[PDB]
């Protein structure tokens, strides 16, 4: 059932916005990255391109690829997507404007497909990290260890847990329109779309027309090449110009809700328990920085906290009634230290 | 600096004595015992008489013209001001003046003599380094002396000046295992530091 | 006007030198990297390959690709260049031997195209960083912020601000020449080029010839396969063998001069000004490490400097006459703190 | 002589195991990575894929590529191997199940070829570093410097210095077998291989057969689709199910023995020796963190150790009889400091 979210698919178009460091510098990429969310734990980021990949223009195959080239879409194959950061990421799934991808940490986020003639990427700043949930501060999820309640995004699309406003596009520039009528500047239209037109000189002042000419002005560089083409709504990017007329409809879901997955998760190597008189020597040797902590169960709590990444023999003045001990997200231990001094 | 290495000589069987060319900090050291792999394996048919003469001199970067610190011996000079007086009923004069206590400036209608001020604190010290806009009242060592790595390892009088002083401790080492290249062992500049271990 | 620097183009060839860690180890790549310059600010590095991409051998299209394969060039398309570092860089422009590319910081520099049958890359060590100009120590240029005078290289080629010496090549080895004349080792020539020849045995001692034979020696491994082919000069790489004859002409410009561009540049979030009695409490919260500093305008300066990356409430004993305050490359503020103790 | 280790080649097959983070998550890749060994110094890691690349199924060309697709091999070209870590690695050589590759440091290890229709990679956690041998703590091997006795793996295959047990595979699942006989679940056989079969219901209880049917059960999901196909042994991966019958033969070498290569290795820039009265001031300026240390040659040793990465002017109270000085793996110096106080 890839055919349950024609809310977005039929009615939304691949938006195009201003990528900030688009290979060279600020281009206008269709895959312009907004709303980077390195807020989960599972090595995953949910991203929004302004491009709406997924099904085609019409009806088929999530795994195809529709961005904007020109005023027009290009609903073709996804062949060579690349999200990346400090390292190349791993795609997880796309739906709508939105992609989920398993990334490592990275100061930035750097996205891009390959149309085939050109690289045509888009890149952005965003502070990314991946702490796993647990008192172990890994840099990456392992193959083993305990499972425990992480925060993470779904693989799936059949999703309604939230919805973001997606009303119309404003106009857009297209000076490919403003040709010349052998002495006058000549506007045309896409398909009968609504072209909003006048020039610095006095001539036609609104523009809701088929292909007009321009009686007064001559220069292409002093005219209103506009495309009110609101047959398909958009995401309400900050890098969108408002459609000044109205808040049109187009409430549209988000696929990648943050969910309470139990990540395959961390585990720190077991401790070396060593006895002394009402005292735990613990030669200790972790894999990664591990937050150890305890609770001397007297009404005097006297707890301790210390991230341990360097192997360290530590000590704990255990009392008569007991202490507990938390080697990372490994479960909490407990200890009777009554006498040992005879 | 830029260690703009001139391309070394490789005599195939026997020595090539180097000479101390007058380039700034012209470091050159003959080397033997090579077998220089160059695109066909080695090419010189001997095996110890294969000689390699490495030479490297210091030269101003292209950034030296534009991104460059700049020392100065700073004396006191003479202070100025664009003194506005919206005078009386005149209501205007915005004139540039001096401080030395006999200079008038008859701009507008009034004649005005200023200073000399009593507060002779030149915030500039005697010795100053200057960089783009950030000015440093630094005891730059001198032209002609600056220890390598320290500030002023390269010391050119101006940008045009072909002569300079390049104490960079540029020391060539022999290339490895019979391959063509030029080990230049050198302190990155005291202009590289002085941009990230500087003063305020 | 791509036709204004035939100084280099006609007269220089794609040099080949010894790349240091050429995928496996030290190969001889035509794109052997010398003179890495991570000395500007704008995320940019100017590099010299020993390869001269740009126009072809003859006259056309900067965006083609001429390296050395064999003794010979290969002036073909640039299709899949890759400069990279810690992350993949972005090309900016090529001219001559030289490429400009927008890179992030990286311990190394790692370059390479794809001829099509082979990866054929070249890699090198070089300490790279990108401080932007400003009291903010970013890791990357943003989309917004103030403009201020950075150091940076140009996009362009119409450039004469400096020129580097580019005289001849020395000889080069080519043991493809030294075939066998069915019992004797047989040298040939490229096109009538000047082949400098003798063997360990006594035979022809100079070699300025067409295809010679070798009367005396037999083994290919004891002969002088040389190519004095000085019809086109080279860059004076350290990884060049001297042309022993002479300092031939060939003074040749550099395209990518460092220029005083105003980078789109940094800006740190505004401070939270808080009043106290002759004292500025300032709860402060930057994006990146920001060098704050002040100047108590008394003849007692009493300045302060501290890079701030961690958000910090700070304090400043302002005097009667005034203090100034510099939140990064955000402009300097100033403050009247007369009394407030009534 | 690529034809001297038919011990492995003829008799071992490309094993398939469970990769831990196989792009998405835990797949079963033939290139499932076990025994990562970032234990040498030369930028190198020896890895074992469960896949046996090398010669083909039969007899030719180390540089071909046989993994398991299906129950079956696929002995084809190696075209687009990729080992990688934090950065893309460099292959060194493959032999058998095993590959050597020059990698940088990396928190993980991430391997993968490209069959051509699919990326089909495999990735794993492993703490990697590359200290070079020497008192210099580089991050990478240079082009120059002294040679000294590093630990490192070979390029070659003609290798017997160790051998790992490689006995049979256990069975494997293949539910492509369990088709339906139009009402009954229908098992088949690869080539007459030994299929070990029964269902939760009561029917045929061992299964050593050609293509059987199933009288009793109907559902594919309650039957024993097994392949006892022990015509070729395997590596004894932890991600192997035991062949319960026996410890069959198949003692098989390791190619990539750790050997006492002298790595091209480190060297720290020379010191600046400065005299004082029985005291060495040393303005010092390294490339990388360098462990300096000394030995005041009195029977009072009074040594010192400090890694130096930041340039530092240091001091050493030299005695009358002498001191020695060790600027990294640069050779040890020695010094007469008799009087200088006149």
Swiss-Prot record, chains A, C, D:
Protein name: Spike glycoprotein E2
Record text on subunit structure and interactions: Processing of the precursor of protein E3/E2 into E2 and E3 results in a heterodimer of the spike glycoproteins E2 and E1. Spike at virion surface are constituted of three E2-E1 heterodimers. Interacts with 6K protein.
Domain of life of the organism encoding this protein: Viruses
Record PTM text: Palmitoylated via thioester bonds. These palmitoylations may induce disruption of the C-terminus transmembrane. This would result in the reorientation of E2 C-terminus from lumenal to cytoplasmic side.
Job description of the protein: Plays a role in viral attachment to target host cell, by binding to the cell receptor. Synthesized as a p62 precursor which is processed by furin at the cell membrane just before virion budding, giving rise to E2-E1 heterodimer. The p62-E1 heterodimer is stable, whereas E2-E1 is unstable and dissociate at low pH. p62 is processed at the last step, presumably to avoid E1 fusion activation before its final export to cell surface.
Localization, UniProt: Virion membrane; Host cell membrane
Section of the entire sequence shown: 325 to 666 of 1242
Membrane topology: Single-pass type I membrane protein
Residues in the Extracellular compartment per record: 1-342
UniProtKB/Swiss-Prot annotation, chain B:
Region (E1 fusion peptide loop): 34-51
Glycosylated residues (UniProt): 84
Subcellular location: Virion membrane; Host cell membrane
Cysteine-cysteine disulfides: 12-44, 13-46, 18-28
Membrane topology: Single-pass type I membrane protein
Post-translational modification: N-glycosylated.
Subunit text: The precursor of protein E3/E2 and E1 form a heterodimer shortly after synthesis. Processing of the precursor of protein E3/E2 into E2 and E3 results in a heterodimer of the spike glycoproteins E2 and E1. Spike at virion surface are constituted of three E2-E1 heterodimers. After target cell attachment and endocytosis, E1 change conformation to form homotrimers. Interacts with 6K protein.
Functional description taken from the UniProt entry: Class II viral fusion protein. Fusion activity is inactive as long as E1 is bound to E2 in mature virion. After virus attachment to target cell and endocytosis, acidification of the endosome would induce dissociation of E1/E2 heterodimer and concomitant trimerization of the E1 subunits. This E1 trimer is fusion active, and promotes release of viral nucleocapsid in cytoplasm after endosome and viral membrane fusion. Efficient fusion requires the presence of cholesterol and sphingolipid in the target membrane.
UniProt name for this protein: Spike glycoprotein E1
Taxonomy of the source species: Viruses, Riboviria, Orthornavirae, Kitrinoviricota, Alsuviricetes
Residues of the full protein shown: 852 to 1051 of 1242
């Amino acid at each position: 059932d890839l055919d349950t979210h024609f809310t977005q698919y039929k009615l939304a178009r691949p938006y195009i916005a201003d990528c900030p460091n688009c290979g060279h510098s600020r281009c206008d990429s269709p895959i312009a990255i907004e709303e980077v969310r390195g807020d989960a734990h599972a090595g995953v980021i949910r991203i929004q391109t302004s491009a709406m990949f997924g099904l085609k223009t019409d009806g088929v195959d999530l795994a195809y690829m529709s961005f904007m080239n020109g005023k027009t879409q290009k609903s073709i194959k996804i062949d060579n997507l690349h999200v990346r950061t400090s390292a190349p990421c791993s795609l997880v799934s796309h739906h709508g404007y939105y992609i989920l991808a398993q990334c490592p940490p990275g100061d930035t986020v750097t996205v891009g497909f390959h149309d085939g003639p050109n690289r045509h990427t888009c890149t952005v700043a965003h502070k990314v990290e991946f702490r796993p949930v647990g008192r172990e501060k890994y840099r990456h999820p392992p193959e083993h260890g305990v499972e425990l309640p992480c925060n993470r995004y779904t693989h799936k699309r059949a999703d309604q847990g939230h919805y973001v406003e997606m009303h119309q596009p404003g106009l857009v520039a297209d000076h490919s329109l403003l040709s010349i009528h052998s002495a006058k500047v000549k506007i045309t239209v896409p398909s009968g779309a609504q072209v909003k037109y006048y020039c610095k000189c006095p001539d036609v002042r609104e523009g809701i027309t088929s292909s007009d000419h321009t009686t007064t002005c001559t220069d292409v560089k002093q005219c209103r090449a506009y495309l009110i083409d609101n047959k398909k709504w958009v995401y309400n990017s900050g890098r969108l110009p408002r459609g000044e007329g109205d808040t049109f409809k187009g409430k549209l879901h988000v696929p990648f809700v943050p969910v309470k997955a139990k990540c395959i998760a961390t585990l720190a190597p077991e401790p070396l328990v060593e006895h002394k008189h009402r005292t735990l020597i613990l030669h200790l040797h972790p894999d990664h920085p591990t937050l150890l902590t305890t609770r001397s169960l007297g009404s005097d709590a006297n707890p301790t906290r210390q991230w341990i990444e360097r192997p360290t023999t530590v000590n704990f003045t255990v009392t008569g009634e007991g202490l507990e001990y938390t080697w990372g997200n490994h479960p909490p231990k407990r200890v009777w230290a009554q006498e040992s001094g005879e | 600096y830029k260690t703009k290495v001139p391309s070394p000589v490789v005599k195939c069987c026997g020595a090539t004595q180097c000479t101390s060319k007058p380039h700034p900090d012209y470091q050159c050291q003959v080397f033997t015992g090579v077998y220089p792999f160059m695109w066909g394996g080695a090419y010189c048919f001997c095996d110890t008489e294969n000689t390699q003469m490495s030479e490297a001199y210091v030269e101003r970067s292209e950034e030296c013209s534009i991104d460059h610190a700049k020392a100065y011996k700073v004396h006191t000079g003479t202070v100025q001001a664009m003194v506005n007086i919206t005078y009386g009923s005149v209501s205007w004069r915005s004139a540039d003046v001096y401080v030395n206590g006999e200079t008038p400036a008859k701009i507008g209608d009034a004649k005005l003599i200023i200073g000399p001020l009593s507060s002779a604190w030149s915030p500039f010290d005697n010795k100053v380094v200057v960089y783009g806009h950030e000015v440093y009242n630094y005891d730059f060592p001198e032209y002609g002396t600056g220890k390598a790595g320290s500030f002023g390892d390269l010391q050119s009088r101006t940008s045009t000046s072909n002569d300079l002083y390049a104490n960079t401790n540029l020391k060539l080492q022999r290339p490895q295992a019979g391959i063509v290249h030029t080990p230049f062992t050198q302190a990155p500049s005291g202009f590289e530091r002085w941009k990230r271990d500087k003063g305020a």
